[PDB]
């Protein structure tokens, strides 16, 4: 249904060890599709998904120029942030930026984003109106006045409403065999005795895409959300994801427990039970 395009950027200064490290990656939904690393041999933006390789060399030239320019801007901005926060030149600091757009099933803009962070904390963010700013502190208010004077929000709005949406739709069409394919979870339940009295039931979901999933345990149709241990959804390494949910159960009572799986790749939700 709904889709997103995001570009992520990290610059990390390293005083005494050369210029800051700069790494940026682009995502459509949960799929990484481009990458640039300043520390790589002859840095260029590189493809990481098959559907983006069909773009011509002028695409990769422009992308690489933009990345190199961002790395340069970050070097200057990191020096400025030292002044804004009365910091010494000896420490390592981190500058992060994300921007992108969400589009709905009808292919129109749902929301645009552009936000920056310094040393892991919010610095300045474009508001949902794509016309105003939220500054985190008095330093970021200095940036906010500069950006209001230079009409930065109007420049971002043009991109987020226009190019961001148009190029996302292009990618979704060229990558439709993967980006518009939901892979359903392969599911099973395993049984792990703790003692003579109790056992862990673990409900597994493997090999699904996209990462969004809901796993819950029920006993006689009552949600055991209080007693369920969930792991964070984790990448399998092959584009797909994994997750499990576990409950501790009185031995001999396993058949009272059902695991419920919801994912966009499934016709209808699944219910599983432990099978001896």
């Amino acid at each position: 249904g709904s889709h997103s395009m995001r570009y992520f950027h990290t610059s990390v200064s390293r005083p005494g060890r050369g210029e800051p490290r700069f790494i940026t990656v682009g995502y459509v939904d949960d799929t990484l599709f481009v990458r640039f690393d300043s520390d790589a041999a002859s840095p260029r933006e590189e493809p990481r998904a098959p559907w983006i390789e069909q773009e011509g060399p002028e695409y990769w030239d422009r992308e690489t120029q933009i990345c190199k320019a961002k790395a340069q801007t970050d070097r200057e901005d990191l020096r400025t942030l030292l002044r804004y926060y009365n910091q010494s030149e000896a420490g390592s600091h981190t500058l992060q930026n994300m921007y992108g757009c969400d589009v709905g099933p009808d292919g129109r803009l749902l929301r645009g984003y552009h936000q920056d962070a310094y040393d892991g904390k919010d610095y300045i963010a474009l508001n949902e109106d794509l016309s105003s700013w939220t500054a985190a502190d008095t330093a970021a208010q200095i940036t906010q006045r500069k950006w209001e004077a230079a009409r930065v929000a109007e420049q971002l709005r043009a991109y987020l409403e226009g190019e961001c949406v148009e190029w996302l739709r292009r990618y979704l069409e060229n990558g439709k065999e993967t980006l518009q394919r939901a892979d359903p979870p392969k599911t099973h339940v395993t049984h792990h005795p703790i003692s003579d009295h109790e056992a862990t039931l673990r409900c597994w979901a493997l090999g699904f895409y996209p990462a969004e999933i809901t796993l819950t345990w029920q006993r006689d149709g009552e949600d055991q959300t209080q007693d369920t241990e969930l792991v964070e959804t984790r990448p399998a390494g092959d584009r797909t994801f994994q997750k499990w949910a576990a409950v501790v159960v009185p031995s001999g009572e396993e058949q009272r427990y059902t695991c419920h799986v919801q994912h966009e790749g499934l016709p209808k939700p699944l219910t599983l039970r432990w099978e001896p």
Binding site: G26, T73, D77, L81, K146, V152
Partner: peptide, 9 residues
């Protein structure tokens, strides 16, 4: 595709 960043902090 990416947006040119043309502003400083």
């Amino acid at each position: 595709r990416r947006k040119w960043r043309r502003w400083h902090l």
